[PDB]
Write a protein that binds this ligand. Structure first.
Ligand SMILES: OC[C@H]1O[C@H](OC[C@H]2O[C@H](O)[C@H](O)[C@@H](O)[C@@H]2O)[C@H](O)[C@@H](O)[C@@H]1O
Length: 708
């Protein structure tokens, strides 16, 4: 047997051993041809009129092996001067087999074409098109920049606030940690601020959900756009100060709505709280240690099959794949969740909201049960995202492999899919969903029921996903509180976002701050991260407290911990476990101090979030919004305003006993001493109980009780 897929697995940053590299070669380029034939004596390619012998040949070694890296054949062809038809022939001991015919057409960049780039006015130059015998594959063009212009935007970015001088793209991808290092993201947008030095600033939005690439050198920003059947790039330009630029974007693509004030309290989470006993014990420790928590996320709450039913719940399976009613279920005394309603009711009585984990995937690896019935129903009734051949798409990723994706691009399947979760909101009264994932769709030719194809619709999927569960909550009369890592243009209007998975490191800390700042610049209001990281060994006391202090001054303050296989010792990120692991007796008292202060901040946050939604001036706010003509601000990219009145300067290095903050124009006050401070550089002591925070002098009469 022998297999060749020209596009391969269609990992956006990597190639599989079975594919053609590159998929679309430029004229003059050679092409590499991979093939997987685990047992064959010899493998040859019939290439045009020639015959090309294959040898035995960014994926990891574990991932590549699963795709057949062992027993993979490859050969580099002659350069592509024209379209070539080709196939492969493999022999095992005289037994012969041949692949279907494939064809590749080389492409060229040209300024000649019927294609238009519309809307850029006189800012656009150097328009060109990537064309082959198949058609126009990509547009490309240049935006004029001036000296001192910064590029801030592109959704949530982990490497730097200013993207000028960098190569990057916008595509939804799950990068498992180290997002800043690889320069990737779960939440890209083809939008950015061009932040003026000197004169009036502006911004742009490339209107597409397809892939876009970006690079800047000298005075030009180069924008490359993937295309569909129509060779047209629609470009929107927004003129004004940074807030006004954001307004133009958000007026076009959507905007946050006010969420309930309780989302501004501390969120407690850990993945290994997989029983009612554990959740209640963890929240009890919160109560007993007097550490206020406003919400608890339960990730492993479910049967781990369909992920819409409590673990060890007893019910009659519905063969038709219809949704369950609350009364369908029984909960046994000896099960993992003997009385989930009683648990939630008690939590609610304590003022704690309850959030359940979600994934937009239906496991196919079971032949029985509700999970199998629903999977069969998805295919039968057309609720699944489809391949080009009409079969159901199966997850090509390594996380939840082969699972189906519900097609959330249309209302009927959004209804059908969320209907399975309805009893959770209406009976059990859960207050939100942590809607994880959504990046799972890989293929250019995938078909969505809304008429979009994969190259267009795959980036849109996480937006549909958050909206689906936001709508479920609305339909139950509750605020649309969803908690999502993934998104795209339009995500601004659905729920809360966190920065995804990272190790516990100072680098990840710094990356996360950048992620929040860039996200806010694009209109993402309610944002957080897993403070001091959720993955690997427990953070040390210093990193934990530096992160905890700063996060209390961020839109969403939440701690979380990755699945450890239920080993001992625990990897929990709870304050008392950190104290336990580090042996540091300052962790619980100082975290309690931060959490207690955070509670006092809720009315301020609530008011500021309302201003942010009305004026589009960001909640976690880079200084260029108010201060754009101040050149000095760019030397302190980790500083920000929290709402109008508070400037925050996180301590991002270990061992720091002092910290220096740049205060822009206006009068300021040190919130810890109540003293007045002159604008410009300011240095103050930073013991672990302090993160530098300054208040506009005119409103310190309002903020003073908070810090008293
Ligand atoms: O038991 C529920 C769930 O736990 C893990 O998923 C948790 C993980 O989900 C995403 O990676 C989020 O970004 C993280 O914050 C969460 O900790 C397991 O991997 C999964 O199989 C399981 O169903």
């Amino acid at each position: 047997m022998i297999k060749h897929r020209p596009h391969g697995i269609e990992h956006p940053y990597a190639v599989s051993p079975d594919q053609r590299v590159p998929v679309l070669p430029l004229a003059g380029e050679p092409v590499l041809l991979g093939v997987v034939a685990p047992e064959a004596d010899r493998v040859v390619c019939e290439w045009g009129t020639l015959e090309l012998p294959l040898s035995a040949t960014h994926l990891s070694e574990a991932q590549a092996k699963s795709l057949g890296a062992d027993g993979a054949w490859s050969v580099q062809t002659p350069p592509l001067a024209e379209p070539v038809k080709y196939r492969f022939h493999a022999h095992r001991g005289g037994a012969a087999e041949s692949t279907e015919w494939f064809e590749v057409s080389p492409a060229v960049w040209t300024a000649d074409g019927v294609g238009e780039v519309r809307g850029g006015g006189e800012r656009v130059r150097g328009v060109e098109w990537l064309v082959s015998s198949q058609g126009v594959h990509r547009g490309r063009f240049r935006l004029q920049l001036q000296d001192g212009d910064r590029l801030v935007g592109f959704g949530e970015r982990y490497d730097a606030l200013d993207q000028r001088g960098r190569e990057l793209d916008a595509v939804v991808f799950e990068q498992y940690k180290a997002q800043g290092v690889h320069g990737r993201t779960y939440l890209p947008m083809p939008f950015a601020h061009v932040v003026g030095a000197d004169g009036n600033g502006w911004g742009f939005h490339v209107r597409t959900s397809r892939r876009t690439w970006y690079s800047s050198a000298g005075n030009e920003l180069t924008v490359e756009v993937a295309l569909g059947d129509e060779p047209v790039v629609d470009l929107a330009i927004y003129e004004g100060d940074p807030a006004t630029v954001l307004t133009g974007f958000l007026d076009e693509v959507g905007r946050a709505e006010e969420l309930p004030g309780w989302v501004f309290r501390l969120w407690a989470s850990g993945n290994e709280w997989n029983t009612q006993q554990l959740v209640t014990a963890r929240m009890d420790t919160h109560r007993d240690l007097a550490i206020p928590v406003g919400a608890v996320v339960i990730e492993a709450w479910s049967d781990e099959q369909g992920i819409t039913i409590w673990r060890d719940a007893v019910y009659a399976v519905t063969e038709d794949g219809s949704a369950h009613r609350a009364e369908d279920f029984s909960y046994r005394p000896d099960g993992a969740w003997p009385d989930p309603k009683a648990m939630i009711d008690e939590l609610h009585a304590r003022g704690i909201k309850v959030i359940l984990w979600q994934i937009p995937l239906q496991k196919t690896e079971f032949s029985t049960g509700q999970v199998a019935a629903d999977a069969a129903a998805m295919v039968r009734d057309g609720h699944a995202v489809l391949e080009a051949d009409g079969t159901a798409y199966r997850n090509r990723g390594w996380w939840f492999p082969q699972a189906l994706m519900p097609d959330l691009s249309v209302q009927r399947t959004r209804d059908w899919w969320t209907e399975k979760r309805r009893y959770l909101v209406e009976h059990f009264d859960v207050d939100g969903f942590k809607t994880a994932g959504g990046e799972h769709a890989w293929g250019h030719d995938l078909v969505y029921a809304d008429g979009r194809k994969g190259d267009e619709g795959n980036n849109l999927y996480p937006v549909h996903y958050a909206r689906a569960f936001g709508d479920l909550l609305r339909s139950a009369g509750k605020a649309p509180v969803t908690f999502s890592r993934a998104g795209f243009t339009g995500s601004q209007a659905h729920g809360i976002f966190w920065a995804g998975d990272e190790d516990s490191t100072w680098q990840a800390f710094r990356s996360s701050v950048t992620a929040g700042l860039t996200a806010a610049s694009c209109g993402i209001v309610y944002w957080g991260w897993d403070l001091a990281g959720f993955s690997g060994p427990v953070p040390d006391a210093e990193l934990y407290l530096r992160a905890a202090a700063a996060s209390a001054f961020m839109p969403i303050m939440q701690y979380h911990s990755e699945f450890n296989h239920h080993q001992l010792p625990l990897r929990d990120r709870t304050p008392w476990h950190v104290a336990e692991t580090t042996g540091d007796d300052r962790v619980v008292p100082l975290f309690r101090r931060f959490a207690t202060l955070r509670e006092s901040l809720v009315p301020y946050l609530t008011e500021q979030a309302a201003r942010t939604i009305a004026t589009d001036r960001p909640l976690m706010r880079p200084l260029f919004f108010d201060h754009e003509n101040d050149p000095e601000i760019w030397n302190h990219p980790y500083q920000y305003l929290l709402g109008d009145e508070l400037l925050i300067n996180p301590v991002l290095e270990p061992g720091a006993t002092t910290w220096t903050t740049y205060l822009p124009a206006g009068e300021w006050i040190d919130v810890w001493t109540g003293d007045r401070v002159p604008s410009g550089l300011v240095t103050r002591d930073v013991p672990l109980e302090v993160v530098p925070v300054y208040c506009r002098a005119s409103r310190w009469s309002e903020l003073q009780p908070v810090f008293s």
